[PDB]
Write an enzyme that holds these catalytic residues in place. Structure first.
Site, PDB file in Angstrom:
ATOM      1  N   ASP A   1       6.459  -4.419  -0.231  1.00 11.93           N
ATOM      2  CA  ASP A   1       6.302  -3.033   0.262  1.00 11.93           C
ATOM      3  C   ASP A   1       6.215  -2.952   1.774  1.00 11.93           C
ATOM      4  OD1 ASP A   1       3.646  -4.219  -0.168  1.00 11.93           O
ATOM      5  OD2 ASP A   1       2.811  -2.199  -0.125  1.00 11.93           O
TER       6      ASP A   1
ATOM      7  N   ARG B   1      17.495  -5.325   6.433  1.00 11.63           N
ATOM      8  CA  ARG B   1      16.321  -5.173   5.570  1.00 11.63           C
ATOM      9  C   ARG B   1      16.797  -4.999   4.124  1.00 11.63           C
ATOM     10  NH1 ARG B   1      14.701  -1.409   9.354  1.00 11.63           N
ATOM     11  NH2 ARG B   1      14.799   0.271   7.803  1.00 11.63           N
TER      12      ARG B   1
ATOM     13  N   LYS C   1      -0.089   1.551  -5.368  1.00 13.85           N
ATOM     14  CA  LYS C   1      -0.840   0.688  -4.447  1.00 13.85           C
ATOM     15  C   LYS C   1      -1.435   1.547  -3.325  1.00 13.85           C
ATOM     16  CE  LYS C   1      -0.874  -2.077  -0.533  1.00 13.85           C
ATOM     17  NZ  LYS C   1       0.243  -2.887   0.012  1.00 13.85           N
TER      18      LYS C   1
ATOM     19  N   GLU D   1      -9.815  -4.342   0.418  1.00 13.39           N
ATOM     20  CA  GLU D   1      -9.689  -5.617   1.095  1.00 13.39           C
ATOM     21  C   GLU D   1     -10.775  -5.868   2.142  1.00 13.39           C
ATOM     22  OE1 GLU D   1      -5.944  -6.667   3.155  1.00 13.39           O
ATOM     23  OE2 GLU D   1      -6.797  -8.618   3.591  1.00 13.39           O
TER      24      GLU D   1
ATOM     25  N   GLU E   1      -7.512  -1.370  -4.266  1.00 17.86           N
ATOM     26  CA  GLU E   1      -7.499  -2.479  -3.322  1.00 17.86           C
ATOM     27  C   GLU E   1      -8.474  -2.294  -2.164  1.00 17.86           C
ATOM     28  OE1 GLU E   1      -3.627  -3.378  -1.811  1.00 17.86           O
ATOM     29  OE2 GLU E   1      -4.215  -4.818  -0.332  1.00 17.86           O
TER      30      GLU E   1
ATOM     31  N   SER F   1      -1.015 -10.963  -6.686  1.00 21.71           N
ATOM     32  CA  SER F   1      -0.216  -9.832  -6.144  1.00 21.71           C
ATOM     33  C   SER F   1       0.084 -10.267  -4.711  1.00 21.71           C
ATOM     34  CB  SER F   1      -0.936  -8.509  -6.191  1.00 21.71           C
ATOM     35  OG  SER F   1      -0.149  -7.500  -5.535  1.00 21.71           O
TER      36      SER F   1
ATOM     37  N   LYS G   1      -7.375  -5.201  -6.943  1.00 22.08           N
ATOM     38  CA  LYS G   1      -6.745  -6.118  -5.990  1.00 22.08           C
ATOM     39  C   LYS G   1      -7.719  -6.423  -4.851  1.00 22.08           C
ATOM     40  CE  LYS G   1      -2.522  -6.791  -3.203  1.00 22.08           C
ATOM     41  NZ  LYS G   1      -1.052  -6.592  -3.171  1.00 22.08           N
TER      42      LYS G   1
END
Lengths: 360, 360, 360, 360
Positions: free
Chosen positions: C33, C55, C146, C189, C187, C299, C229
């Site tokens: 992503d 890309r 996400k 983090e 997520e 992931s 995550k």
């Protein structure tokens, strides 16, 4: 929670009336609630042995003062033993005080206990059977109560844990008192210990007070029927001193941002401040150029009594001398409560009354 | 709060080991912690007089049972008085039990008190001097503790107030126990009273437990050194009964969503369930086709004792008869704790063991 | 809040089924992503110009990989631009991936923003019109989402404020996704930036996750229809390295203490770990001798692609070499997710892929 | 969180100064922020067609009013569209207002969105890129912002979820606004819809406000740089009407118990109150014999415009007439803002401006 019961009209009125009386213009509280051990430390200091009778004697001095005292003293916070003691002539202390139109208060907490796993922080105990204890105290002539929580400034403290818990316990205590027709004085003391600056002190105080009032709301406490007893905002005991002007601004700013107008009054604790500082600081607080919606007065212990003890020095022939010191400082504080105290007018007073190592 | 202290390795090991022992495969707890008054009602039922000696006699019966009991009973929860009682021959109850390899537990709460302004909700008291009490209990041979909170399902209850307070008080109690080398059993009982459905009971149970674990987190409680004693998820006492499978599913879903895998085990309370329902329900819970990361067992009082009391009937002769009923039910529950109970195989048992209104 | 609605049975089943498919045994996620700019950084390292088509060429390589890949890759997280891009022959990337049985995920956050007054902390934006965005993404073939929150370990961080806010935003995001039939990957983090030890990283991680799950409960998020995550628990990037066994124990303890068993799976981020380290660490995690009620998989973004980029080196002639590196590492990670990886068996791999920053 | 940064002295002064200006004695706010669709309804009922120019026209009327308006109107809230329109002669509306000394406010929320699983409750969206939006608005002449949250009184609502979330989003909004030199007006609107009594409305309002100010503290919002826009406390629209005095006491009590004195002022929304009602109520509020540490004024929409539209009717010849109605109503509300309004001295006003259905 939106579905709850407001206290009965009869109860609201009673509680509001008591609180209003305690903070009547030019009046504050004398905190005389030292336990056996603590009082013992005060006595030793003047060569006096810590006996029940010596403690009773000292309280008798305080309590037999000229009725003029009631001009500046609305209430007295008692330690349990004192509530049931008698003067030399057999008159109950409770009766002497009531006759002079002074309201009786009682210390109801059971001291601090450690928060396991915290970085040396504490909470306060004493909720067990508090309702029953309150109903007895009320019958025995008490109308307000005192409960002390301690918060410490350190590297990481006060923590979220400490703030949450102390805020919650204060609300539990207040609720119970109110249920039994007793006005709770909420006392979240941020200790002066340490070398932090005024900025840190102000931020800590603001954080603490916000939590306190959120907890009071969660537990549906009737604000009009309470008093707050906070620390003035100052730098740490080991840091540079601030001016009365600086202290006053930080203090009033912290209160304006956290303490609802519904709260009947604020009765400041003196911490480690000398007798003179405590007065001068209170006076400045009452001169801050901001709206101050509550009475700003005193609830002083050491700051009302150090000179009294020194003068008495355990001798009967010095009773009048001790009582004189009390009268002088009560008047000074009464003036401060009206923002009219002239620095140094009540005398030099004591030195620092700082005793470190609280809570834990 | 991110800066905090985990318990010492040696304290962690001790607490975890104790909790692990209590929920060993095929074992559960006998809750014999009825106070004078409660025990009094149960005796009266079988035409026995509530004397301390009659209570001692009944407790002697339970504790002198064939050591075979120990195969299914890992621990016994005691009421204060009983912990210091002795058998006819002079042997201390504590010794009899420990000799048999049974772990001793102690009820440490001081009952429920009303939340002022709430719609008839309560919290539990008994934190005062709990650390000192625990230290003594540990010395006297106890290794786990019990403390009961009561939540009520009604129009607007449990409220946020009740949830916050009950979760916080459980966290405080648990922390104190751990500091004194005692495993706390956390018991947030959602009462069966009312005519609410299974849907409502599940949502209430999930809400309650989430708050409980957030509070244990906030106060840095070591989860591996605790146990949970929850209600099973059932419709209200006055609603249509559900099947064992409906109950089991709702219950396991509720726990999966809220109780961390780190919690060593779940010891169910029986509520108002008959002896047989309590067993059948537990067995079904142990057969739900979802991952169940903790031991799922019993901590039964009335559900392990109704038939004992009936059989005994206060008669000295009937001692063996009573004890036999205990062995019967202990074995049945031991099997259920492993998902192996054959319905009705241990007999029909007793009637409904429901008694209303626990909070107040 | 006890009065609320569970999702329809149909929605529950759909969300639960998607989540389960993503974490099937031996499978994990390929995070592809990267935005233009970020992708540009990657292309630059290998001497390729950051163009829309370069890309595209790179994405073409990844996605045209042998269908064997689907044995180890269950889902791919895409950047918005990529979801609508086509291979050279005119086939939509989405169709190529779906034909191979890979599930499509979409990054829906709008990056981090500063918390004014905080000590350099952030929250995440992207809630505005999310429901409508999700409905479109679902229609366009996406089944999961996400959303990245960033917490920083420093002197006083993460703060209560940061924890509260990040948990709340994650809960709002997850609820919105679920309402539109999309599985949210939560997520939170905790950055590895700094010189803190494993102890500090574990305490921070457990604190963060407790708050995350309390917020999910407060917002009534269906846990069985979600994935987590998180970072593995490791010391800071500038502190001494831990062994795989130390990391594994700390990580599994932290999850056992906070993530309910109802959560279908955990898909680890690799942080700044090298390709080999991320694999070795995941394998050790799947061998911790404690109950692990959820799938523990990967992931991975850079940890799956570093060697791919290097082998490819922007050349059409190196397509086979490039795809081979992907297959090799996907396999190695599928083995790790089963606790079966043999250290070094997939080669040396990348150097350290640590990039400092995040949040701001 | 105790470790955080106060805003710079410069920022503080600017925000405080703006807020102070808005609540200058005898002055209030004209809310003219109706969106295209909303404005359309108002026009339709006067038989005017909802065209961009029609809206422009009607807005020209309001803004071109005799400069005497500025005597009672401190600020006008604009809808995005309006901020960039011009008068017939081609003088930008923004320029017109500013020359008259009127301060410009801008509505920045993006409307309400449903809370999934809730019993028909909502939150407000619009945080995405709010800083960048605010930066631009400031450059374009705006000094304050508007954001509306909606809370609904029902069987079980507002829930804890709704309260927590709405309070949290208000704090995020307020913080962002402040970071960009914009004064946020905090608007937690408790809808009048329903048949609840005044007691319920007060209890709900007090609950909501306590949460709002806890959230502002948690996010470190500078209260002196904010305004509050709440509902007056009244029984439900379908309930028995209360007297202005009852309404007034309830409202002042609710505010005294929850809104810190640090908050520069309260600008009341009219809800579904008639033009006269809104005025009489405001006047009574400013007469409650209780300390009121903040300015208590108006921020009226329909309540200022109802008669205007009627007078206008869409006819160019009625311009003066409409303008006169505005002047009359602004005067009366200015008076009310001072507690000096003589009931019925301003005419009669509309009937009921109540439209049911705010959230969703």
């Amino acid at each position: 929670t939106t579905y709850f019961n407001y206290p009965s009209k009869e109860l609201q009125d009673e509680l509001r009336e008591i609180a209003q009386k305690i903070v009547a213009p030019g009046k504050g509280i004398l905190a005389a609630d030292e336990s056996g051990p603590t009082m013992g430390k005060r006595l030793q200091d003047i060569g006096v042995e810590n006996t029940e009778d010596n403690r009773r004697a000292y309280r008798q001095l305080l309590f037999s003062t000229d009725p003029k005292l009631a001009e500046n003293i609305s209430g007295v916070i008692l330690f349990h033993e004192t509530l049931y003691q008698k003067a030399d002539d057999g008159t109950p202390f409770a009766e002497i005080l009531k006759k002079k139109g002074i309201i009786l208060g009682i210390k109801v907490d059971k001291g601090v206990v450690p928060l396991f796993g915290s970085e040396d922080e504490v909470t306060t105990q004493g909720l067990d059977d508090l309702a029953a204890r309150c109903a007895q105290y009320k019958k025995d002539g008490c109308d307000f109560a005192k409960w002390r929580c301690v918060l410490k400034i350190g590297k990481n403290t006060p923590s979220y844990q400490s703030i949450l818990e102390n805020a919650n316990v204060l609300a539990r205590y207040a609720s119970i008192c109110q249920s039994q027709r007793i006005v709770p004085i909420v006392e979240p003391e941020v200790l002066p210990d340490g070398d932090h600056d005024l900025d840190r002190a102000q931020k800590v105080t603001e954080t603490v007070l916000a939590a306190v009032y959120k907890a009071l709301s969660d537990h549906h406490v009737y604000l009009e029927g309470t008093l707050l007893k906070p620390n003035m905002v100052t730098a740490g005991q080991s840091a540079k001193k601030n001016t009365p002007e600086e202290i006053a601004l930080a203090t009033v700013q912290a209160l304006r941002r956290t303490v609802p107008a519904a709260v009947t009054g604020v009765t400041f604790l003196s911490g480690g401040q000398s007798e003179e500082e405590a007065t001068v600081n209170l006076s400045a607080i009452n001169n801050v150029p901001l709206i101050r919606p509550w009475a700003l007065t005193f609830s002083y212990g050491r700051a009302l009594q150090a000179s009294v003890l020194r003068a008495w020095a355990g001798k009967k022939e010095n009773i009048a001398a001790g009582q004189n010191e009390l009268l002088k400082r009560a008047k000074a504080n009464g003036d401060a409560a009206q923002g009219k105290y002239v620095a140094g007018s009540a005398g030099a007073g004591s030195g620092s009354l700082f005793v470190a190592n609280h809570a834990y």
